[PDB]
Design a protein around this ligand. Structure first.
Ligand SMILES: OC[C@H]1O[C@@H](O[C@H]2[C@H](O)[C@@H](O)[C@H](O[C@H]3[C@H](O)[C@@H](O)[C@H](O[C@H]4[C@H](O)[C@@H](O)[C@@H](O)O[C@@H]4CO)O[C@@H]3CO)O[C@@H]2CO)[C@H](O)[C@@H](O)[C@@H]1O
Ligand SMILES: OC[C@H]1O[C@@H](O[C@H]2[C@H](O)[C@@H](O)[C@H](O)O[C@@H]2CO)[C@H](O)[C@@H](O)[C@@H]1O
Ligand SMILES: [Ca+2]
Ligand SMILES: [Ca+2]
Length: 605
């Protein structure tokens, strides 16, 4: 039996990806706390750019890492389709890949034009709240021959190519369409050279630190696989010689690893696997050795707990990416010693992430023992006051998300939501991780949870009305009502609200003489009252036009003070809406709040 249930981890990983979706969500949506969002993406350029994935805990749709994630996800499915079949996750993987690939098609309106970003990094990062109610404008950026982006373009080509292979048997039509798009994108990237971060304002988030050379090799190889066109393999091998060497030696880079920016490492193994040339094998060997035994005395930093810590930001992601590729290489190399080394290294790194560490805790949200509970994720947190600090605990469980983890080689970590360097989550963080999981399911087995996902229930009323007697009076009843929108299942706008306060006509009180005034009212103040039947009447406060949403202190609520003066004879004790209203602001169950005529809170007479 496996040390950890890899099938379950994988199953949750796929759920995470579904939680990262943007656009109009399907009817079959598994994440109850996610609603439609980014519905006007692309409007600024008259295009429909809805869909795709939110990059991390933020809401900007960064094309570069989104494309990479897609390729890594497809890669793992090509390596171990059995792993996805066994864990019963194959349909979800295809579903997730279809989601991001549909978007890529939407974003490629012509052969040499690719939209690589929707949203502004700074503006988007200045606000902290659920995606469904984002209040900022989201500009769409692109790359064309006038300002190319060979890296992002070639990656998107690789993404669509690799996926076409996955859909090949299921949807030959779809597969063909991805292949067609991929060729155009690769051509565009090879013909118009350039770094995409020179054209789109993503440099502060996903700067093209290595250039496009690695993507030209990467993209070529994958198109080769999808098409079978030998010229593509030729293209890859040629471009391979132009890869980055290290410091002073003529040796190709071996001290880092494959991630959204640098695909050099992937190509070492991929071409070695394809051709079997010593040239590739040496590079792949040197890289994987630096991560295991070391080369020339140098070795990637290791913690006492056994974790390979490459950098501070998203440490587990790097180790996980290497763990996957290592497993892939472990099957092609004949060397018994190396095969063991790489394979054992991979299982160790994945196991560490799943719980086998000094803290004996999982680093995969919602999985294992003592998992993280507060990752740096806006929608998962569910703040309604534009604050990362409130509420204390994330209101949702982002099942399957792999956190950054220990940024230093000391196995230390603190589940702090405000730590985006170690506690943020991301689509690419789970890319290499998921592929490794699929390989491990095929080998060590595991079984998915029959009843998953659990259906979360709201942590209280989401949209309600609170009230208290503002000023005591005997010929009138002055109320201080506070409309609230703290929704999270999912977050929703409340722009057509109205509420009713029912009261009973008293002996000696002429309705004609009843007045409704206010000294402070963020909504409208009505002139007359409304007779229902008999002695039953009601005051209607109109808040339509007011955008009440869980995204700020003043945004989520509307204060309405209102005095109903009836003169001598006025008696609030027989009034329906008055039941329960004390001197402290508290939910008023008898004041009905309506969203466009539909009751959302309270009970009517
Ligand atoms: O020089 C060594 C090596 O560098 C490689 O590039 C690194 C780069 O040095 C490093 O700064 C960068 O760090 C990224 C990180 O990988 C990424 O996960 C994170 O993403 C953020 C994003 O910036 C936010 O906007 C938001 O969306 O959240 C996410 C997740 O937190 O951002 C940081 C900073 O940009 O990673 C690069 C890739 O490893 C070169 O590729 C390599 O060739 C060099 O040898
Ligand atoms: O880019 C780093 C990190 O920023 C996070 O948003 C920050 C924002 O950059 C800062 O100006 C503001 O004061 O605080 C917010 C919240 O920490 C963003 O949420 C991360 O995704 C991103 O990785
Ligand atoms: Ca690159
Ligand atoms: Ca009365």
């Amino acid at each position: 039996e496996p040390a950890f249930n890899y099938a379950e981890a994988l199953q949750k990983s796929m759920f995470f990806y579904e939680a990262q979706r943007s656009g109009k969500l399907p009817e079959n949506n598994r994440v109850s706390w996610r609603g439609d969002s980014g519905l006007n993406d692309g409007a600024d350029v008259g295009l429909d750019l809805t869909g795709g994935w939110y990059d991390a805990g933020d809401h900007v749709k960064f094309g570069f890492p989104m494309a990479f994630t897609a390729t890594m996800l497809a890669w793992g499915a090509i390596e171990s389709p059995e792993g996805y079949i066994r864990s019963g996750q194959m349909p979800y993987l295809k579903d997730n890949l279809r989601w991001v690939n549909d978007y890529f098609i939407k974003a490629h309106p012509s052969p040499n034009v690719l939209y690589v970003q929707v949203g502004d990094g700074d503006a988007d990062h200045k606000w902290w709240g659920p995606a469904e109610v984002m209040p900022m404008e989201r500009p769409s950026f692109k790359v064309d021959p006038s300002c190319p982006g060979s890296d992002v373009a070639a990656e998107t080509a690789a993404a669509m190519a690799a996926s076409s292979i996955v859909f090949a048997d299921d949807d030959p039509a779809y597969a063909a369409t991805l292949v067609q798009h991929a060729k155009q994108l690769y051509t565009f990237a090879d013909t118009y050279r350039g770094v995409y971060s020179d054209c789109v304002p993503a440099g502060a988030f996903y700067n093209s630190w290595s250039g496009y050379q690695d993507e030209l090799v990467w993209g070529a190889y994958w198109l080769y696989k999808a098409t079978g066109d030998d010229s593509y393999l030729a293209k890859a091998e040629y471009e391979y010689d132009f890869l980055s060497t290290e410091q002073q030696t003529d040796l190709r880079s071996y001290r880092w690893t494959i991630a959204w920016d640098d695909k050099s490492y992937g190509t070492y193994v991929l071409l070695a696997k394809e051709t079997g040339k010593q040239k590739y094998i040496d590079d792949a060997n040197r890289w994987l050795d630096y991560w295991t035994v070391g080369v020339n005395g140098q070795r990637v930093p290791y913690s006492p707990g056994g974790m390979a810590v490459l950098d501070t930001w998203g440490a587990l992601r790097y180790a996980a990416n290497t763990a996957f590729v290592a497993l892939v290489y472990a099957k092609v190399i004949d060397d018994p010693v190396r095969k063991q080394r790489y394979h054992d290294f991979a299982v160790r790194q994945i196991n560490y992430a799943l719980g086998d560490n000094p803290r004996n805790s999982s680093y995969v949200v919602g999985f294992g023992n003592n998992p993280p509970r507060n990752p740096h994720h806006r929608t998962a947190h569910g703040s309604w006051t534009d604050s990362i600090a409130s509420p204390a605990e994330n209101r949702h469980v982002l099942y399957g998300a792999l956190v950054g983890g220990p940024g230093s080689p000391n196995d230390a970590y603190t589940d702090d939501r405000q730590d985006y360097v170690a506690n943020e989550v991301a689509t690419d963080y789970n890319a290499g991780f998921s592929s490794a999981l699929a390989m491990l399911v095929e080998e060590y087995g595991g079984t998915p949870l029959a009843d998953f996902p659990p259906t979360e229930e709201p942590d209280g009323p989401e949209i309600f009305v609170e009230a208290q007697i503002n000023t005591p009076g005997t010929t009138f009843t002055e109320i201080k009502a506070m409309i609230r929108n703290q929704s999270g299942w999912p977050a929703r706008m409340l722009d057509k609200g109205t509420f009713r306060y029912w009261f009973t006509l008293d002996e000696g009180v002429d309705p004609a003489d009843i007045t409704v005034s206010s000294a402070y009212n963020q909504c409208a103040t009505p002139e007359d009252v409304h007779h229902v039947s008999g002695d039953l009447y009601y005051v209607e406060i109109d808040c339509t036009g007011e955008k009440i949403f869980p995204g700020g202190q003043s945004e989520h609520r509307r204060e309405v003070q209102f005095r109903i003066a009836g003169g001598p004879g006025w008696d609030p004790s027989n009034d329906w809406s008055f039941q329960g209203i004390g001197n402290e602001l508290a939910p008023a169950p008898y004041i009905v709040l309506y969203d466009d005529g539909v009751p959302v809170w309270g009970t009517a007479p």
